[PDB]
Paper text:
Of these, Trypanothione reductase (TR), a flavoenzyme that reduces trypanothione (TS2) to its T(SH)2 form, is of significant interest. T(SH)2 and TR represent a major defense system against oxidative stress for Trypanosoma parasites, similar to the glutathione (GSH)–glutathione reductase (GR) system found in humans. Despite the three-dimensional similarity between TR and GR, these enzymes recognize specific substrates (trypanothione vs. glutathione), suggesting the possibility to design specific and selective inhibitors of the parasite enzyme without off-target activity on the host. Targeting TR thus represents a viable approach to reduce Trypanosoma virulence.
The structure of the complex between TbTR and compound 1 (TR-1) was determined by X-ray crystallography at 1.98 Å resolution, allowing the identification of the binding sites of the inhibitor and the definitions of the details of the interaction (see S2 Table for crystal parameters, data collection and refinement statistics). Inspection of electron density revealed two binding sites on each TbTR monomer, unequivocally attributed to compound 1. The most significant of the two binding sites, indicated as site 1, is located inside the wide trypanothione binding cavity, where it partially overlaps with the so-called mepacrine binding site. The binding is dominated by the hydrophobic interactions made by the core of compound 1 while the arms of the molecule are more flexible and point respectively towards the inside and the outside of the cavity. The phenyl-triazaspiro scaffold of compound 1 fits well the hydrophobic/aromatic patch composed by Trp21, Met113 and Tyr110. The bicycle-heptane moiety extends deeper in the cavity, into the hydrophobic subpocket lined by Val53, Val58, Ile106 and Leu399, and is just 6-7Å away from the catalytic Cys52 and Cys57 residues. Thus, the binding of compound 1 in the cavity is incompatible with the binding of TS2, consistent with the competitive inhibition observed by kinetic characterization. The second molecule of compound 1 binds an almost hydrophobic cleft, indicated as site 2, close to the dimeric interface of TR. Therefore, it is reasonable to assume that the binding of compound 1 in site 2 has no effect on the catalytic activity of TbTR and that the observed inhibition is due exclusively to the binding at site 1. TR-1 structure is very similar to TbTR in the apo form or bound to the substrates indicating that compound 1 binding does not induce global or local conformational variations.
Residue numbers in the entry:
A (entry chain A): 0 to 489
B (entry chain B): 0 to 488
The structure:
Amino acid sequence: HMSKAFDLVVIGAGSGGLEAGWNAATLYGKRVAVVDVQTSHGPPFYAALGGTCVNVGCVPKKLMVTGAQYMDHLRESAGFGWEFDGSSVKANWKKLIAAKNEAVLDINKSYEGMFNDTEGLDFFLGWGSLESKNVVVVRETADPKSAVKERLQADHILLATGSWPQMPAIPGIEHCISSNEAFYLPEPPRRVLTVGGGFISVEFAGIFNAYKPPGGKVTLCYRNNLILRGFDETIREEVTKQLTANGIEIMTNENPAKVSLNTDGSKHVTFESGKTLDVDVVMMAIGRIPRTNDLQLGNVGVKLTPKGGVQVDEFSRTNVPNIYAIGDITDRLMLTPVAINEGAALVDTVFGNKPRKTDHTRVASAVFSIPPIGTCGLIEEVAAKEFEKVAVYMSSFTPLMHNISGSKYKKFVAKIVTNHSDGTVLGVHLLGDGAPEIIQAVGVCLRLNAKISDFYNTIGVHPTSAEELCSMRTPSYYYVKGEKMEKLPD
Amino acid sequence: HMSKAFDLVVIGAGSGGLEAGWNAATLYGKRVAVVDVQTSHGPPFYAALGGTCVNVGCVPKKLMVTGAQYMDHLRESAGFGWEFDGSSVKANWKKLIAAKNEAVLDINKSYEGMFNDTEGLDFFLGWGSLESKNVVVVRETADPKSAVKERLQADHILLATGSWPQMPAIPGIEHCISSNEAFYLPEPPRRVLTVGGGFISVEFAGIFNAYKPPGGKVTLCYRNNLILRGFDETIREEVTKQLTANGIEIMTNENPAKVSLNTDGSKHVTFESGKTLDVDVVMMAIGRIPRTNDLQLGNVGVKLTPKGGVQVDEFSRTNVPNIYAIGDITDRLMLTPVAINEGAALVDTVFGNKPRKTDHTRVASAVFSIPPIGTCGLIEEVAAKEFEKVAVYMSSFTPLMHNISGSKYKKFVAKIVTNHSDGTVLGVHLLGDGAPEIIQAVGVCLRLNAKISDFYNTIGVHPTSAEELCSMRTPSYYYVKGEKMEKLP
Ligand SMILES: Cc1cc2nc3c(=O)[nH]c(=O)nc-3n(C[C@H](O)[C@H](O)[C@H](O)COP(=O)(O)OP(=O)(O)OC[C@H]3O[C@@H](n4cnc5c(N)ncnc54)[C@H](O)[C@@H]3O)c2cc1C
Ligand SMILES: Cc1cc2nc3c(=O)[nH]c(=O)nc-3n(C[C@H](O)[C@H](O)[C@H](O)COP(=O)(O)OP(=O)(O)OC[C@H]3O[C@@H](n4cnc5c(N)ncnc54)[C@H](O)[C@@H]3O)c2cc1C
Ligand SMILES: CN(CCCN1CN(c2ccccc2)C2(CCN(CC[C@@H]3CC[C@H]4C[C@@H]3C4(C)C)CC2)C1=O)CC1(O)CCN(C(=N)N)CC1
Ligand SMILES: CN(CCCN1CN(c2ccccc2)C2(CCN(CC[C@@H]3CC[C@H]4C[C@@H]3C4(C)C)CC2)C1=O)CC1(O)CCN(C(=N)N)CC1
Ligand SMILES: CN(CCCN1CN(c2ccccc2)C2(CCN(CC[C@@H]3CC[C@H]4C[C@@H]3C4(C)C)CC2)C1=O)CC1(O)CCN(C(=N)N)CC1
Ligand SMILES: CN(CCCN1CN(c2ccccc2)C2(CCN(CC[C@@H]3CC[C@H]4C[C@@H]3C4(C)C)CC2)C1=O)CC1(O)CCN(C(=N)N)CC1
């Protein structure tokens, strides 16, 4: 049962856990154990070796959004002279899912090869939990009464089990799915309700909108007034219009009260307001919660936050000295590259003895909505509270290609938020094609404390959308002590 | 004929000339005249109000490349489950050209509105030339014996007439076209030869490749071993492979010696080697030369360089005090945003009395090839001569989508060149989808003297191609005193 001492035992072979494990083994020559619940994607556990991103997150959803974008490309090609039989166009969901599955499986297999070929980096199949401060027990199932496969003696323990979809406690919740199941639907739904205002709901609404069979309809509902809270307000409003223009129904200030089955097997959703909707799939995407319930954290007294995340300091330390937590389990920025950076920083701190912490400010991120979002740093509302004088530079225009394409609704939006006292760029927010690619090097600019003048004195690359960031010299409006106004008082 | 004094007379209403004119009129309250040969795009002189970029350059080119990209999208859609009758797919070139024409004409019309609505900004139709230091004459044609339309008295003169396609002196050059005429072909050529290894040749090869009718073939020829001289060598090699994979024939070490007309109107090209090729169109894209012949610069003695550009200092000043030159006529970086920047800087210097100059280093640019290129700063061969220790960081990978799409040849290439003594990024070179958009903010990073660690300590955006720029920690190889090697001593 008991193992030889590992320097590090990682529970969860995902984005953060694999970076920590790999770095500890290869950069510092340490003996590392990594635990996960299966070696390949999909039911019943969905996540697997590689993590949520590889298996049921960033990687497959990006492939599926790319697939969905072809609906727009096929239509838009006509404006540039492409002609074909429109009545022959069919979207084969089964083919998409099969191709996605092969791609994810290849990644699963490549991670299996990493463990085989790397000395001092060992994989253990099963469910990890804390028996004591220096013992991780690996059992056959999530049930703590299931059979022990081994006990891993651990000098250090890393909790990196990620998050899991939140499901509301409403009648007929068992008739709904999450993003996990959406990845394995045997057929594309004719009618679908995506529940939530966040990026997962918005992204899947776009995917379903493109692959739906004839006479179909995608509806997104959100309990508050405006989707995508935490993103730039102009972009939130503008994405809503552009989703609507592509046939997606957006129900704001609406929330399901119950779901029941119609006699034909479809789902009848009743909302709190009294509204109803019949759909084939109800996909819940209202949040993700830290995955702590199976770790038996009470055995060692690892503290959780009020919201349920493992409580950590800036260096990923729990209240128990040799036990650390990174990634989505900490309930902060649920992004793969953040988990990776936290894992790397942790290993440098613990095994390199040079403390390093992840900077959670000015992190660039994206929403692969159609059209997509790219963002880095503060929205103007948040900046207006932290700084006395804030300037907002805004450009909004339909690119010339979309006059020709017939998608006149596709406005590109670029916004730069600054501290007007010294011109320091506090945030950049982009909506439109290429936005996720444009924003990466903007992340590097914000790390370097770029000012607005560093942007407008840089020579543009023409013709691009990106050059709009270097063409904004004069603020569109300001915030003075929190108060919006077009001009500054003298 | 002789006007009242203008503060500035601009010859050429293009990228640089319009920026200068607008800024001088609106920011400094000056009285400005701008001269161009046409009010809208197309034959006989092609460029017009708006410049080369608007009329027969960046703007229409980009729309046409966007059109061409749909051949790849339609094909690649099948990998993601899209099904349709492939046998019904046709590319209507006439429809592309008509849409392009409307878009460009709208821009021409908006520029007419600018002149109508702006006090002290006046447009004059005709051919500008220098009569004397303080007089620009506007004539009916480029012939200096043609009729005078008016004489413009000028306190300052800006030469901003751009450039023009270079045509080799071969027998049957009259049977060839340039990029100018390519924009107005009534039908897409079944067979086309694009002559030259530069960006225009490569871009048009991609355009013609997508719109060619059945049984078609695009051939690109270049007189030396490898296309795209001046770009990163890895990218030059890789883009050659990717063009070939999309069906374009690349003829290196070949150059046309003559062209004759076949009896069906097609062209018979004979190369210097003795090889021959029959094509429907021969597009010369061997270079662009400064447009100085019609300005009568000998009347005032404005100095040209040995290459033929108007000689200028770093502030765009000629050898004659009140006469300046910006844009492609200076024969340096032939890019629209550089011409614009030069025009703004000139006006601040002359009318603001606060001297400003354009920085011609670390300028980001793109090639809208399929796949496209984005680049900023130095290639490693140039860096290795100027710096003692240079590191090259390189990543080349086929993106995951392109396993599914069936275009496995579409490798993304990311290269960072640094001064290894302090880690300062000297250049960044990208090949693959998104490269032109990725490289813009990289331009800003280089202005801020970004080091390699500023890239690899920035958190990635995932999944993107761009995040490869933040994932390269260890050099792939070095140059030490100009000598390539895998490891340092
Ligand atoms: C639909 C969707 C789309 C997303 N898109 C993006 C995107 O575009 N960009 C982006 O940056 N982020 C995206 N994310 C977020 C990203 O997936 C996460 O932030 C990231 O995966 C978190 O990494 P981690 O190391 O915290 O945990 P994960 O990568 O989730 O790994 C946790 C692993 O632990 C395993 N595990 C759980 N419990 C146990 C146990 N008791 N014993 C052993 N193993 C266990 C799981 O099987 C899993 O493989 C997306 C998420 C979802 C759901
Ligand atoms: C096919 C092609 C594609 C290109 N693509 C790009 C790109 O993607 N990105 C990029 O940055 N650059 C591109 N360029 C380069 C860009 O177009 C030029 O750098 C830019 O237009 C130069 O601006 P300018 O002010 O020097 O002159 P121009 O914009 O060329 O303007 C010169 C004007 O002067 C007029 N003129 C000439 N002689 C006289 C006279 N005697 N009297 C009156 N008027 C006169 C012409 O009609 C013309 O309108 C491209 C060029 C070509 C040919
Ligand atoms: C009677 N035939 C004739 C063909 C008519 N069809 C069938 N069809 C279809 C699509 C998927 C599964 C089964 C049938 C389509 C539906 C609508 N079009 C939409 C094409 C869109 C419209 C604009 C842009 C996006 C895409 C572009 C043409 C590129 C595709 C073909 C269509 O127009 C078809 C059916 O038998 C198939 C079954 N039908 C159904 N379930 N409603 C319709 C009748
Ligand atoms: C960020 N990585 C840490 C992860 C380490 N490894 C090592 N490794 C490996 C595989 C076989 C033998 C030896 C080592 C891999 C390399 C490739 N990965 C696949 C990564 C995919 C690519 C696309 C998406 C899914 C996952 C994402 C990058 C998230 C599997 C395992 C891997 O990810 C740093 C690396 O330098 C590790 C070493 N690398 C390499 N040997 N090619 C490249 C990347
Ligand atoms: C179905 N018929 C007529 C359609 C054949 N055509 C005509 N045609 C065409 C294209 C432009 C103008 C005039 C006629 C094409 C030839 C070229 N292909 C292009 C294939 C594209 C290339 C990129 C993407 C779209 C499709 C993909 C590979 C999916 C479609 C249209 C095509 O496949 C075919 C036959 O008559 C010809 C072959 N047959 C025979 N030798 N006995 C019998 C059947
Ligand atoms: C520094 N200037 C350079 C030249 C100024 N003007 C002023 N102007 C104008 C037009 C009518 C009445 C008064 C002033 C224009 C506005 C935009 N242009 C249209 C040209 C488009 C804009 C961008 C690309 C597509 C085409 C390109 C210039 C190639 C016409 C002339 C213009 O370009 C830039 C702007 O003034 C241009 C106008 N701007 C805008 N509408 N948002 C941004 C600032």
